[PDB]
Design a binder for this molecule. Structure first.
Ligand SMILES: *[C@@H]1O[C@H](CO)[C@@H](O)[C@H](O)[C@H]1NC(C)=O
Ligand SMILES: *[C@@H]1O[C@H](CO)[C@@H](O)[C@H](O)[C@H]1NC(C)=O
Ligand SMILES: *[C@@H]1O[C@H](CO)[C@@H](O)[C@H](O)[C@H]1NC(C)=O
Lengths: 182, 217
């Protein structure tokens, strides 16, 4: 609510089926960094940022344990009521203007994701391409749902085309968001 | 600068109370459970008025909370009561949280956040183009792209070989890209005529002076 800058910290998410965890720090809608729970290390999104600030990775692991604990409880304390699935959206768009031959990044914005278990796949003329592909941590939404981003590093050409493929237990079948320079 | 983390308090025993039916859902899912904690703390006017709010969400419902303008944990829903009371009784628990407004918030703003977020100035790229299918018919659009900028406060304006034009002007919304940079598109419905010089005026993010790009004749 009413406030210039907003610092979202210690965001700890955990999912019962699957021992699935995510620990993140956000600022004004932007990810400061996330802690790999496996590698056990702070990963900043802006490497410049990492060189000026630091975070102890054990803090994040430490919080997941709590979150992990707390879940079971509420789970119990709640006659084991499952979470209701939702239908996510999808918007694709280029980082910068299309200019054939010149490197560009295709962005696939997904919002209203819940639960935080989604599959996002890039399709180049129907060819599940994987490489030069990047993805972001789940972002917090007001209604406690989420939204994630995927990035496709590509070379534009007025011939081939693309299609961001989204799969979520909330959609009867994969949603296809088509984008093309033409 | 080391950033401080907001801590989550443990949920009391939690016997496993049977929460009578409500308004669930279905028609295409499975059995899943999601927990969420976050130490959101609101800044305004420098670090003069902070407000710390820790929320614990079950599935997708905030069940317990801690507001800084309350000074204690308040159950947002019945299944919170257990937690709200216990945490409000332990000085070890409630006084530590009560302290995050400075240790886990004023600290971060003044420390990491100022030497990082608050100093992020990325100047915007700008170039104009020609769209709207073919020429004179009802189609002749000029698009000025303002990309890869940050912070978000920005102002973009069109100009017809002289004055500011507002009619037939359309600009997208903010459009975050996820990587700490913004981009906003500004279209202009027009007709090119000999000698006409259109220009796009952009300003703020990191320009000590409002930049301008011309689209000759
Ligand atoms: C996501 O990919 C995994 C990999 O096998 C698969 O098991 C799961 O069903 C997929 N979920 C969807 C539909 O997004
Ligand atoms: C607990 O869950 C069982 C199984 O869904 C349900 O039948 C029962 O109504 C719940 N407990 C209560 C409040 O009776
Ligand atoms: C409060 O101070 C900040 C300085 O960072 C300024 O941006 C803001 O305009 C001031 N209050 C308002 C909203 O007028």
């Amino acid at each position: 609510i009413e406030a210039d800058h907003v610092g979202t910290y210690g965001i700890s998410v955990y999912q019962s089926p699957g021992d699935i965890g995510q620990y993140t720090f956000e600022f004004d809608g932007d990810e400061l960094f996330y802690v790999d729970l496996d590698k056990k290390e702070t990963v900043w999104m802006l490497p410049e940022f990492g060189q000026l600030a630091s975070f102890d990775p054990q803090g994040g692991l430490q919080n997941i344990a709590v979150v992990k604990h707390n879940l079971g409880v509420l789970t119990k304390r709640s006659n084991s009521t499952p979470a209701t699935n939702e239908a996510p959206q999808a918007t694709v768009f280029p980082k910068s203007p299309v200019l054939l031959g010149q490197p560009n990044t295709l962005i696939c914005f997904v919002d209203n994701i819940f639960p935080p278990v989604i599959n996002i796949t890039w399709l180049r003329n129907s060819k599940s391409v994987a490489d030069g592909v990047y993805e972001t941590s789940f972002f917090v939404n007001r209604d406690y749902s989420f939204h994630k981003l995927s990035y496709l590093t590509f070379i534009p050409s007025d011939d081939d085309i693309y299609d961001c493929k989204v799969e979520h237990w909330g959609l009867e079948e994969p949603v296809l968001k088509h984008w093309e320079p033409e | 600068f080391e950033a401080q983390k907001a801590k989550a308090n443990k949920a009391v025993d939690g016997g496993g109370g049977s929460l009578v039916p409500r308004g669930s859902g279905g028609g295409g899912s499975e059995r899943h459970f999601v927990y969420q904690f976050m130490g959101e703390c609101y800044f305004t006017n420098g670090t003069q008025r902070i407000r710390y709010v820790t929320r614990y969400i079950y599935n997708r419902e905030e069940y317990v909370r801690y507001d800084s303008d309350v000074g204690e944990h308040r159950a947002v829903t019945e299944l919170g009561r257990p937690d709200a009371e216990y945490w409000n009784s332990q000085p070890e628990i409630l006084e530590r949280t009560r302290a995050e407004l400075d240790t886990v918030c004023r600290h971060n703003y003044e420390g990491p956040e100022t030497h990082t977020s608050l100093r992020r100035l990325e100047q915007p790229n700008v170039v104009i183009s020609l769209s709207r299918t073919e020429a004179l018919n009802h189609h002749n659009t000029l698009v000025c792209s303002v990309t890869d900028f940050y912070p978000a406060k920005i102002k973009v304006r069109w100009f017809r070989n002289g004055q500011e034009e507002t009619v037939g002007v359309s600009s997208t919304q903010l459009i975050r890209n996820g990587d700490w940079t913004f981009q906003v598109l500004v279209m202009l419905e027009m007709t090119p005529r000999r000698g006409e010089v259109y220009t796009c005026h952009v300003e703020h993010p990191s320009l000590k002076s409002p930049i301008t790009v011309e689209w000759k004749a």
